[PDB]
Design a protein around this ligand. Structure first.
Ligand SMILES: Cc1cc2nc3c(=O)[nH]c(=O)nc-3n(C[C@H](O)[C@H](O)[C@H](O)COP(=O)(O)O)c2cc1C
Length: 305
């Protein structure tokens, strides 16, 4: 069973991906990369690309037109060995553009895009998608991917229209004869969720997304649980050290100012269920100096114990 960190725009940058690998994740993905922005040499897209030496990390691209996706894939293939296509995002901005989950609105057009991308991805080509645009059409979507030579598939078990409402219907993948590595995603917050999702879907592995924000040890817990039926929670000292390591990685990769801004997104997760976390978060949300943030987090933990 393989357990990977899902792509999460705004969260899964190189620092968080690295931290996840330091807790046992098997693989990860870049934040979604606009194919058009990449071809335009935009600064924003250039900053999202993984380094070519960064192992086991896909470059996920998004777009609505076959020519931009294929061209971006051909160019990226010169340096990256694994390209993934986002065909699941329900975000309004992305769907309005006809990208992400909007690619599932017309499966004839989806097949066209997948066939053209297959020709342009020299290495491993995967697709991350959903069950369908507005209804479960996963057998057809999966058949397209297998027939067009996709190497691996990641499926968030919700339709695009549901966004994050309703539940991840893990059993929807049980009907699929898994001819290629197939991974389940959706509502995976604990090891118990991970085990049930694997059992109901019949998949080869799973992705952790919201469940890993501020909780990178979830990868080790999931593997511990699947192997032995038991897992443990991190000590307060281990939470502190993880926060410190994450912050150090953020400073190294993005500089002090940006490190503080990015870390703000993970504080709720790191302090989850810690006495007085709400008060602490309120006090640190506007702190701009990285040294002050680090000292307050240290003070908050050592006092909790
Ligand atoms: C903040 C955020 C950003 C996301 N960005 C991406 C993305 O860039 N690419 C992608 O394929 N999915 C993206 N996802 C979807 C996740 O990869 C995942 O499939 C989804 O959250 C369902 O898993 P979960 O319910 O276990 O969190 C995003 C999810 C979140 C919460």
């Amino acid at each position: 069973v393989k357990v990977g960190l899902a792509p999460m725009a705004g969260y899964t940058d190189s620092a968080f991906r690295t931290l996840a690998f330091e807790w046992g994740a098997d693989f990860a993905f870049s934040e979604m990369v606009s194919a058009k922005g990449f071809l335009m040499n935009s600064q924003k897209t250039e900053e999202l690309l993984p380094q070519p030496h960064e192992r086991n990390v896909a470059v996920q691209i998004f777009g609505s037109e076959p020519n931009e996706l294929s061209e971006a894939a051909r160019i990226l293939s010169e340096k990256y060995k694994w390209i993934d296509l986002n065909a699941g995002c329900p975000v309004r901005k992305v769907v309005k553009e006809g990208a992400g989950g909007a690619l599932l609105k017309d499966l004839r057009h989806f097949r066209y895009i997948v066939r053209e991308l297959r020709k342009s991805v020299s290495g491993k080509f995967s697709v991350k998608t959903r069950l369908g645009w507005e209804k479960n059409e996963v057998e057809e979507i999966y058949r397209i991917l297998v027939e067009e030579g996709v190497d691996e598939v990641f499926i968030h078990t919700r339709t695009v229209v549901q966004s994050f409402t309703g539940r991840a219907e893990w059993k929807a993948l049980s009907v699929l004869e898994k001819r290629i590595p197939t991974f389940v995603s959706g509502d995976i917050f604990t090891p118990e969720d991970a085990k049930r999702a694997l059992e109901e879907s019949g998949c080869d592995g799973l992705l952790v997304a919201r469940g890993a924000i501020g909780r990178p040890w979830i990868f080790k817990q999931i593997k511990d649980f699947l192997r032995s039926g038991k897992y443990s929670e991190p000590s307060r000292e281990e939470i502190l050290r993880t926060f410190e390591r994450h912050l150090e990685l953020l400073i190294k990769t993005k500089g002090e100012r940006k490190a503080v801004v990015e870390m703000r997104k993970f504080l709720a997760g790191y302090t989850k269920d810690l006495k007085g976390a709400r008060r602490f978060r309120e006090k640190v949300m506007k702190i701009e100096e990285v040294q002050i943030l680090k000292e307050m987090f240290y003070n908050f933990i050592k006092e909790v114990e």
